[PDB]
Amino acid sequence: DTRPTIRPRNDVVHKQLSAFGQYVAEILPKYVQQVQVSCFNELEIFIHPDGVIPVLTFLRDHTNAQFKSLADLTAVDVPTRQNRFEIVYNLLSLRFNSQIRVKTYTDELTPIESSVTVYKAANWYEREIWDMFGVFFANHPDLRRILTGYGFEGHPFRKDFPLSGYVELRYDDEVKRVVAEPVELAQEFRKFDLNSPWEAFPAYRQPPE
Amino acid sequence: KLGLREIRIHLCQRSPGSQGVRDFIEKRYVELKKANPDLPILIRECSDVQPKLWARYAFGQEKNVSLNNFSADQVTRTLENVLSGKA
Amino acid sequence: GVRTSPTGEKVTHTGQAYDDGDYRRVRFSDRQKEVNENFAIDLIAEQPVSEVGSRVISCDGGGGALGHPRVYINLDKETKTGTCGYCGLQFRQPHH
Amino acid sequence: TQDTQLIAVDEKLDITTLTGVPEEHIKTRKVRIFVPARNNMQSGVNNTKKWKMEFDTRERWENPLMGWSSTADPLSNLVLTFSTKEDAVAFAEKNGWSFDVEERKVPKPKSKSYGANFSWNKRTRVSTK
Amino acid sequence: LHHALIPHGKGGRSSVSGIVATVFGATGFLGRYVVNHLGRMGSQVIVPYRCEPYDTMHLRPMGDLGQIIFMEWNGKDKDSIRKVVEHSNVVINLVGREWETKNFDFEDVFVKIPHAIAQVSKEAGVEKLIHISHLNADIKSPSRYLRSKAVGEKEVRAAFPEATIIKPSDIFGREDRFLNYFASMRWFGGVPLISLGKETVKQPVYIVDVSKGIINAIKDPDAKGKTFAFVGPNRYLLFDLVQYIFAVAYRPFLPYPLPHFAYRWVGRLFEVSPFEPWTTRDKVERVHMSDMTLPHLPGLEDLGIQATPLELKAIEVLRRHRTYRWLTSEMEDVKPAKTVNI
Amino acid sequence: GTSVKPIFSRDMNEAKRRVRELYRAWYREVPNTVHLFQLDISVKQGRDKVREMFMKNAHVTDPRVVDLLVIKGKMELEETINVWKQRTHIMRFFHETEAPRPTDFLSKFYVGHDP
Amino acid sequence: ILPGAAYTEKSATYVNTEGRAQQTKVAVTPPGLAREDWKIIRALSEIAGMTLPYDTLDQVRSRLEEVSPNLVRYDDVEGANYFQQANELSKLVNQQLLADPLVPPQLTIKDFYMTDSISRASQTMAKCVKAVTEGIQAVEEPSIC
Numbered sequence A: 001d002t003r004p005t006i007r008p009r010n011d012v013v014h015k016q017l018s019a020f021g022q023y024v025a026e027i028l029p030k031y032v033q034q035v036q037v038s039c040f041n042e043l044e045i046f047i048h049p050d051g052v053i054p055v056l057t058f059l060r061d062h063t064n065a066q067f068k069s070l071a072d073l074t075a076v077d078v079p080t081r082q083n084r085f086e087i088v089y090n091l092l093s094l095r096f097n098s099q100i101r102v103k104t105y106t107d108e109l110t111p112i113e114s115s116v117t118v119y120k121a122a123n124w125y126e127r128e129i130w131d132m133f134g135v136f137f138a139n140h141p142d143l144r145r146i147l148t149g150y151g152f153e154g155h156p157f158r159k160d161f162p163l164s165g166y167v168e169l170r171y172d173d174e175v176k177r178v179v180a181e182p183v184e185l186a187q188e189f190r191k192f193d194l195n196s197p198w199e200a201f202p203a204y205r206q207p208p209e
Numbered sequence B: 001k002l003g004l005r006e007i008r009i010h011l012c013q014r015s016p017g018s019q020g021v022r023d024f025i026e027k028r029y030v031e032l033k034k035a036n037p038d039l040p041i042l043i044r045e046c047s048d049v050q051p052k053l054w055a056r057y058a059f060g061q062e063k064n065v066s067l068n069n070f071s072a073d074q075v076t077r078t079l080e081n082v083l084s085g086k087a
Numbered sequence C: 001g002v003r004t005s006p007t008g009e010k011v012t013h014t015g016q017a018y019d020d021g022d023y024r025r026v027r028f029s030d031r032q033k034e035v036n037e038n039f040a041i042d043l044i045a046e047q048p049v050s051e052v053g054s055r056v057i058s059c060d061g062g063g064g065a066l067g068h069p070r071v072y073i074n075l076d077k078e079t080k081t082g083t084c085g086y087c088g089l090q091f092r093q094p095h096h
Numbered sequence D: 001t002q003d004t005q006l007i008a009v010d011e012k013l014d015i016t017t018l019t020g021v022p023e024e025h026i027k028t029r030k031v032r033i034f035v036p037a038r039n040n041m042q043s044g045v046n047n048t049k050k051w052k053m054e055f056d057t058r059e060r061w062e063n064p065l066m067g068w069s070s071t072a073d074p075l076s077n078l079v080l081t082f083s084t085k086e087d088a089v090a091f092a093e094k095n096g097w098s099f100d101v102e103e104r105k106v107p108k109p110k111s112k113s114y115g116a117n118f119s120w121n122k123r124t125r126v127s128t129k
Numbered sequence E: 001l002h003h004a005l006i007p008h009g010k011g012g013r014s015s016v017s018g019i020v021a022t023v024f025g026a027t028g029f030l031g032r033y034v035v036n037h038l039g040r041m042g043s044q045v046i047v048p049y050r051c052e053p054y055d056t057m058h059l060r061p062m063g064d065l066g067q068i069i070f071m072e073w074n075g076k077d078k079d080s081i082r083k084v085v086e087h088s089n090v091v092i093n094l095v096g097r098e099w100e101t102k103n104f105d106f107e108d109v110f111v112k113i114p115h116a117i118a119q120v121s122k123e124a125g126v127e128k129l130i131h132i133s134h135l136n137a138d139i140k141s142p143s144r145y146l147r148s149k150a151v152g153e154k155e156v157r158a159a160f161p162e163a164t165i166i167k168p169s170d171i172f173g174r175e176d177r178f179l180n181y182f183a184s185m186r187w188f189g190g191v192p193l194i195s196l197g198k199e200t201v202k203q204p205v206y207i208v209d210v211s212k213g214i215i216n217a218i219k220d221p222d223a224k225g226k227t228f229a230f231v232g233p234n235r236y237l238l239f240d241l242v243q244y245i246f247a248v249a250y251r252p253f254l255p256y257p258l259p260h261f262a263y264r265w266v267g268r269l270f271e272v273s274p275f276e277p278w279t280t281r282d283k284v285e286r287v288h289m290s291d292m293t294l295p296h297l298p299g300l301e302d303l304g305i306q307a308t309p310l311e312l313k314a315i316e317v318l319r320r321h322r323t324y325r326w327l328t329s330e331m332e333d334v335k336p337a338k339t340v341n342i
Numbered sequence F: 001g002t003s004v005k006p007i008f009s010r011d012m013n014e015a016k017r018r019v020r021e022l023y024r025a026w027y028r029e030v031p032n033t034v035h036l037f038q039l040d041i042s043v044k045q046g047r048d049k050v051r052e053m054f055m056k057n058a059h060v061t062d063p064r065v066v067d068l069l070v071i072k073g074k075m076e077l078e079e080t081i082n083v084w085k086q087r088t089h090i091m092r093f094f095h096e097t098e099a100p101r102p103t104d105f106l107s108k109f110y111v112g113h114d115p
Numbered sequence G: 001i002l003p004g005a006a007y008t009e010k011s012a013t014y015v016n017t018e019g020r021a022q023q024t025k026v027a028v029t030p031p032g033l034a035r036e037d038w039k040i041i042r043a044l045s046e047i048a049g050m051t052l053p054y055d056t057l058d059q060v061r062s063r064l065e066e067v068s069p070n071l072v073r074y075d076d077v078e079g080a081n082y083f084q085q086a087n088e089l090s091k092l093v094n095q096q097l098l099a100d101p102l103v104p105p106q107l108t109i110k111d112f113y114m115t116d117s118i119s120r121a122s123q124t125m126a127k128c129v130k131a132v133t134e135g136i137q138a139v140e141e142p143s144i145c
């Protein structure tokens, strides 16, 4: 084939995903702000934060969507935006053999309606989002830290949280108990600025401001 | 001891609030310097600054007379007021 | 070879040797200060200077793929020899 | 355009008490907002298009052992990227960090003409090509 | 200071404190704490040991990699002492033994060993030698422990002039043989206080306070040549002190009065044990002897430290001795005993 | 821009209300927590440490923020009640092992380049 | 002798000959026990009793603003004026010229290199002045990588 290295691209899936994207957009124009199909046939739906519950319920219950499995629930921390956190939902439809992406936005101080009602799988995913990033979710049953140690300060996955953290641990013999101290690395993490100053992909050349 | 050590004038280049001191300095400053050649009158100007006068007295003391919107005659009358006392 | 320091400690090929007043020496007591003896700075000198009747040469360190990347040395300056940067072997044009 | 029990929250965002940063690393640190200059060794410009946030350097001693560059300041390798100065300068005091901002240096346009290389009168005529 | 001894960091494990300690006999009660306090600040402590390396294992995780160096030394060997103190800034002496071993009596371990340590340290060229001796050190006290200590500190003073000498009164801590010793006396029927312990007056001092006192002495520039005396804030009568111990331990109290000569006999009886003796005759004299106040010598407070009362850190030692009936009792249940004016 | 929907509290008054009983829920069990975890420290220094932690978070003047610490303190109370934090986690609040960092400019100049 | 901080070891404020007041940043902390220059003087004043007001870099920079407001306007040339007034004052007093020709201290390359303390203590700079003084034969190394 003329493209033995380039990954083949499917247009039929692109058309089916695009048609469904318009379908969902017309169904709930109250929350669906923009929708796009990526080059590698993946659909993303951009909803308003208030539409977290209604949009998910429609995708879960509609006969023409039947997205009945929350694959994962994560957020991407982008400090340059007004709402730095960007909650992302990934759903899979077993009946129609397709996956969808539903993404919202949220600043530091704003609660999001927990999707525990629609997807009981979200319950533990919600705690991770709050623990790693700090996004609080209202109506969550048992919202608490899930991964970080007890009495942990801050939210690690935030881009403004240092990788090495603020506190290390040590067994102090004077108190005969493991204690916490300010971090002091034997060798500091050698940061590597390895971004070439030459443009990589002209396709994503952001127009000048 | 509070004998006069230095006088600092901070004036804006184009602000109308510092217009009066500009009128003073083009005319009367030279005559003042002939009167007190030893005195270090400082005219460190700037942009968008409230026209103020600093007078450094001995033993490290500094008064902060502010000549905001003062006219040229007003600026001069403030000056001789500050240096009226030799100490 | 290895030169001993005045304080009585072997000096590494990098020239490292602890000062007499340096406290960071108690580590070596009841142990041994690891130093290599085959000083690469010396051993490369014993290699004979190859003589080839060509303006330029190609050195790969021997072994083809097992050596260093192939470089070309310009043996034009008759004043001195041309040495491969990777391995250090010298070359010289015989009276050009 | 959203009736969600809206209340007046005029006061500036002060999330500092929630980020968990200790007291020391929240005042005595002076962050810098700047557009990084191009690496003068190179000529590309694709690294001078995003505002960067960085923290002032601190002590960096040498280990009693083999001697790496130890440190005790966690906010040493933290570099943040912002697409606009206003977003960058807003992230500083929202997190409660004293900042100084350096304006972007735009290379001024320079008129270049090949014909000037061979000028009848002007001293810009070159002696080699 | 040497080019490699300039202090660096923020006092943490990886921070370079700049002091190369040589804590002698660190495999013990105070040796454990002083190494730890030196370990936190990042000080290369050259810890010599004569015991099994296993008994020094607890010492390893108190300093950054390469900081704590273990060396083998012998008391009756100048070469071993020289080897450990050849590269050092400060040498800490903590060798001691409450009983007389077959190969080591009070004379050997409180005068002979401190003499060799002090003499070799001066020849080596160290800056400060911190030597420790009992507060009750006296040349005429019958207890050879106090008698040997008094001779040693005078000798160490002669050999090393600017050698700070510490005179702690009586340490108490997790493994102190002072609070534990009295708490362990429940097994032997009742507690046989000598003359009911109505005359002996003691001034126990917290072990952590002594440890930080030593460290502050190291960094202090005025400690050169001084002779400190470490005492606790309060001062306790022996009978009431043992009352506080057994009340905090919630154990039955049987104040048996026992004649002094008889006590010297039972101390002899317990001395026969080849292993660690429960108590010796010299130990009986020490608990019977009081801690005289020496206001002329500088106190603990002068080393920028605040003393910790025993009634504040009492449950630390006696929580273990409490049975299950009292393993969970609070701290303030038992109030401090009688406090004779200090 | 100046208006954004709240967490739990509509203004400072009810936000302060949710602080009070949180302090109430923190006062009562401190002797119980000390008993539960075999705290070396007495009850008294437990109570003011709760007070001091509540005190340091006083400059907050935003209803949304105060809700966040209020709910965060609730989890901290929850973690302490059902023995989720051990002695080491509790003793973490009492900064014991670390030496006091002096506050005078002279001492800082003596020890390092710390601003 | 009081060890100070080099220009790469402090966040200073240097003013060029054109009037622009730019600032440097701490590239690496001073070696050994050497501290920042302004903190040394401020600490010295505290010991001597006459403690200075400013205690932080922002404070001393604010004090710098009070003495001269143009020392804080970073990367901004504050244009001066009143040349005529300076000219009139120079008309006062009379100092006469001399016959000594205007000879700059540095006429050739060799004395451009060895000027300041950092340059004088430099090793790579010593090779340069060595190179320009004598011929090429005194400067060469087996330079390959």
Ligand SMILES: NC(=O)C1=CN([C@@H]2O[C@H](COP(=O)(O)OP(=O)(O)OC[C@H]3O[C@@H](n4cnc5c(N)ncnc54)[C@H](OP(=O)(O)O)[C@@H]3O)[C@@H](O)[C@H]2O)C=CC1
Residues within 6 Å of the ligand: E024, E025, E026, E027, E028, E029, E030, E031, E050, E051, E074, E075, E093, E094, E095, E096, E097, E098, E104, E109, E132, E133, E134, E135, E167, E168, E169, E170, E171, E178
């Ligand atoms: N109340 C008190 O007990 C007070 C004690 N002091 C002094 O403090 C010092 C240490 O006390 P403490 O830690 O409780 O004592 P320990 O018996 O608990 O520890 C003594 C230390 O000295 C070592 N040591 C003792 N004798 C010898 C010897 N002959 N050869 C080699 N090493 C030896 C021990 O080694 P190993 O562990 O292998 O036996 C151990 O490291 C002593 O000098 C003591 O007199 C001062 C004031 C008060």
Ligand SMILES: [Zn+2]
Residues within 6 Å of the ligand: C059, C060, C061, C068, C084, C085, C086, C087, C088, C089
């Ligand atoms: Zn080669």
